[PDB]
Amino acid sequence: AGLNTAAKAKGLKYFGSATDNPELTDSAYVAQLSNTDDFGQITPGNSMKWDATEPSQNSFSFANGDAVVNLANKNGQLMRCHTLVWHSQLPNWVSSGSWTNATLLAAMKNHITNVVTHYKGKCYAWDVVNEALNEDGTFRNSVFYQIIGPAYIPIAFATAAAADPDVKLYYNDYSIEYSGAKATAAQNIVKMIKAYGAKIDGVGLQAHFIVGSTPSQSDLTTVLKGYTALGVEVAYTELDIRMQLPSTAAKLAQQSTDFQGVAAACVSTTGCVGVTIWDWTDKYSWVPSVFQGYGAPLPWDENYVKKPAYDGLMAGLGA
Numbered sequence: 001a002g003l004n005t006a007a008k009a010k011g012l013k014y015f016g017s018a019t020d021n022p023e024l025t026d027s028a029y030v031a032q033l034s035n036t037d038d039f040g041q042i043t044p045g046n047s048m049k050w051d052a053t054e055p056s057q058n059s060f061s062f063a064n065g066d067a068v069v070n071l072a073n074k075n076g077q078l079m080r081c082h083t084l085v086w087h088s089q090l091p092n093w094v095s096s097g098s099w100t101n102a103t104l105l106a107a108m109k110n111h112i113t114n115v116v117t118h119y120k121g122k123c124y125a126w127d128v129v130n131e132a133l134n135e136d137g138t139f140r141n142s143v144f145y146q147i148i149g150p151a152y153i154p155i156a157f158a159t160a161a162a163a164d165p166d167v168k169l170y171y172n173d174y175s176i177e178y179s180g181a182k183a184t185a186a187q188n189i190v191k192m193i194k195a196y197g198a199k200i201d202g203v204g205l206q207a208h209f210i211v212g213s214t215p216s217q218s219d220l221t222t223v224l225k226g227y228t229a230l231g232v233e234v235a236y237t238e239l240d241i242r243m244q245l246p247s248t249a250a251k252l253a254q255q256s257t258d259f260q261g262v263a264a265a266c267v268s269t270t271g272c273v274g275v276t277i278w279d280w281t282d283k284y285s286w287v288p289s290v291f292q293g294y295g296a297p298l299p300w301d302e303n304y305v306k307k308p309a310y311d312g313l314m315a316g317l318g319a
């Protein structure tokens with residue numbers, strides 16, 4: 001009957017979508033977000049990030065994150081909670097601080113404990129650390145890495161596990177979905193967290209792909225199995241497939257094939273628990289303001305009408 005029904009029929013836990021608070025006043029938008037045939041899971045696109053939840057040190061703000069949890073709870077949708085430790089969307093007090101290892105570690109641990117305790121029992125998964133890697137697989141030189149060193153990653157996981165032992169703890173990144181230096185380094189993050197004795201349950205593969213430059217079904221499936229071989233689960237967490245504008249029938253058809261391969265790779269991999277698209281309508285896509293000349297990246301257009309990619313997804317889910 002839809003993407004989520006189709007996904008569950010192949011043993012996925014969900015097919016879902018990100019959203020953001022400003023969109024929840026658009027009633028036609030919210031009615032389709034709340035369509036559990038298509039969406040069995042929601043991610044808050046911004047309201048659980050550090051600048052939203054701890055805008056001043058030790059001053060926590062949960063109203064906007066809680067609004068998304070309440071919508072998911074009313075609908076019967078799962079939550080993915082996103083994201084605890086990330087170099088982007090930090091409030092000023094983190095980025096401008098004069099820190100020692102001790103004081104930044106205490107601030108990072110306090111952030112994690114407070115936010116994970118608030119959301120205890122509400123999240124299927126947390127994106128505990130986001131985007132810790134450079135494209136060459138070396139560690140991204142964020143304030144956390146500069147001041148604390150590599151330990152910040154396992155300490156973040158251990159701190160989340162102490163506050164909520166049940167939630168799945170994910171490492172989330174982009175350009176780790178196909179073989180290369182970064183994917184190898186993401187495997188090594190899994191191994192490093194376990195060598196420290198800390199818990200990691202999942203690898204989140206963002207899947208911000210490009211129409212006509214999407215990895216093949218077989219390349220995606222090799223990489224999914226590469227992570228599940230390590231004793232973690234996997235999910236595609238932020239799937240969108242951006243096209244060089246302007247849109248044409250040919251580009252929409254290529255986009256459908258590209259989406260179909262992503263869904264089919266996850267269905268073909270035991271331990272791929274689901275797919276989340278990074279919102280569902282081109283109207284609200286983050287892409288056009290970030291990627292010059294690119295857009296129309298989602299399975300519904302800016303009028304909430306299905307594009308061919310909706311059918312490509314359904315085919316990849318074996319509907």
Ligand SMILES: *[C@@H]1O[C@H](CO)[C@@H](O[C@@H]2O[C@H](CO)[C@@H](O[C@@H]3O[C@H](CO[C@H]4O[C@H](CO)[C@@H](O)[C@H](O)[C@@H]4O)[C@@H](O)[C@H](O[C@H]4O[C@H](CO[C@H]5O[C@H](CO)[C@@H](O)[C@H](O)[C@@H]5O)[C@@H](O)[C@H](O)[C@@H]4O[C@H]4O[C@H](CO)[C@@H](O)[C@H](O)[C@@H]4O)[C@@H]3O)[C@H](O)[C@H]2NC(C)=O)[C@H](O)[C@H]1NC(C)=O
Binds near residue numbers: 147148149
């Ligand atoms: C801020 O404060 C915090 C809190 O006090 C400081 O946290 C400490 O951070 C240490 C890392 O900086 C961290 O050490 C690691 O511990 C884990 C766990 O070790 C325990 O368990 C294992 C397994 O049972 C056991 O073998 C150990 O004896 C311990 O009981 C280890 O897995 C880590 O081991 C890796 O790193 C070391 C050190 O690597 C550096 O130095 C070497 C040689 O000098 C150099 O070659 C290397 O390139 C690095 O510069 C290696 O000797 C090991 O072989 C391991 O290396 C593998 O893994 C790395 C990734 O983790 C790869 O990058 C590497 O290529 C290789 O594949 C390591 O010992 C402490 O546990 C942690 N303490 C606490 C209480 O949390 C933090 O340092 C501090 N920050 C600053 C800037 O001051």
Ligand SMILES: O[C@@H]1[C@@H](O)[C@H](O[C@@H]2CO[C@H](O)[C@H](O)[C@H]2O)OC[C@H]1O
Binds near residue numbers: 286
């Ligand atoms: O509204 C946008 C968000 O959609 C965007 O989401 C980011 C994209 O970059 C990373 O992939 C990250 O994991 C996501 O949270 O963040 C910027 C914001 O303006």
